[model samples]
Target: SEFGSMAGNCGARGALSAHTLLFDLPPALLGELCAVLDSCDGALGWRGLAERLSSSWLDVDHIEKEVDQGKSGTRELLWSWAQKNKTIGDLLQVLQEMGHRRAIHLITNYGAVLSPSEKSYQEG
Candidate 1:
């Protein structure tokens, strides 16, 4: 599957290197993510964070559907699209602004998280 394509292309060694590089995120972006996680009661496990991000992504998709159905005005559509996608893009851009090498590493590591498939709520 394409899931492991990065690993295959980069090789085990490169993958490891890339992953290691990801931990060095910019202070501001790391702080922002940490703040969000803390607000979620410190259950900031990777899967949990991924699921939250996935839900937000789906919200953007829903907005897209609304736009396609002509349910939203041009301004509303653009605002919805920007609010959702721009946040993610900005978050990623934080890493990129740090440096290209670091940015690529961060994205690669993020791609490893299966956000969309994760369970939304914990079983009690």
Candidate 2:
């Protein structure tokens, strides 16, 4: 049980940090989301936003099962938003681009840092 608790903590930590890296959400939004999570007032908070942003990586059937089991209304609400949200779509695209670029660099044993020219190229 102790090990299980430790493992859960590690997974939660990874999940929370992954959002900042993957979604490029502004620090203000991230802080607000953390506050919402800490409050735990049954409000759809960080978990809802993370799940929605990560819908591209989640299985539809698994999400459906969770919703059907009534395990989380947050999942349902986010899933609905994910179906129609253009901003979420754009975020997913950026996440994919970053992940792909990072993976390519990893395969070559190279760092993933973007050079100034590369940054400007991507910006324009």
Candidate 3:
């Protein structure tokens, strides 16, 4: 199964850990998701970080598929994935601490759907 294969691939260096939902998504979707994550470009935003984190999982063919088809749900999936991984929120908090106030706002606007208190906790 793909999931089993994906799970097997998680532990190596440069691989997607079990910590991310990226393993659950199909390769095409996972590639597209990485592209979306790669789009964030503020000083503290995703940018090159996405490639650094997802290099092992990203499929170039799928990225081309996303670009050719113009279909994307990676932004939503990202938030859903973030909800499951507090580490994402922690990263956001670090970005905020580095003075990127918009990092938190971006998470909220993009539907991370965190409560105010939860947001406060993450930002702290």
Candidate 4:
């Protein structure tokens, strides 16, 4: 009975049904992330970041307008993005294709350092 219970509990625990699992990026660390992202905008520009995140160009303009600092426009976009996506992996994924190595490098490496333990999230 014990062996059967162990072997077939919930049919192998529903077969690990999960989607796009990865580490989370909580708001606490977002500021540092945005800060790093802000600097690269000099060469990288903020428009591409919006596209990568599936954000409209108008949203980008709105973010910059609301934030009111050219260096900080990138920072503001992330905070607004924080309202929806706080996924470190997703953010990393976007920044990856956005052609900003330094931005991702800081977050990927520094994100690990900021964290104490590991956990995963399924895609939403």
2 or 3, greater by TM-score: 3
RMSD (Å) of each candidate, 1 decimal: 18.1, 13.4, 13.1, 19.3
Report lDDT per candidate.
0.32, 0.32, 0.34, 0.45
Best by TM-score: 4
Q: Flag regions of model 1 displaced more than 4 Å.
A: 1-88, 116-124
The best candidate in terms of lDDT = 4
Residue pairs of candidate 3 with colliding backbone atoms: none
Error of 4 at 124 (Å): 16
- Tens digit of per-residue lDDT, candidate 2, span 90-123: 3334334434332222222211343111223554
Ranking by TM-score: 4, 3, 2, 1
lDDT (Cα) of model 2: 0.32
lDDT of 4 by residue, 37-81 (tens): 444435766555665665455565464443324223444555564
Ranking by lDDT: 4, 3, 2, 1
Candidate 2 lands at a TM-score of 0.25
Cα deviation of 4, candidate 4, in Å: 70
| Deviation in Å, model 1, residue 117 alpha carbon | 10
Give candidate 1's error at residue 75 in angstroms.
34
Q: What's each prediction's TM-score?
A: 0.20, 0.25, 0.27, 0.49
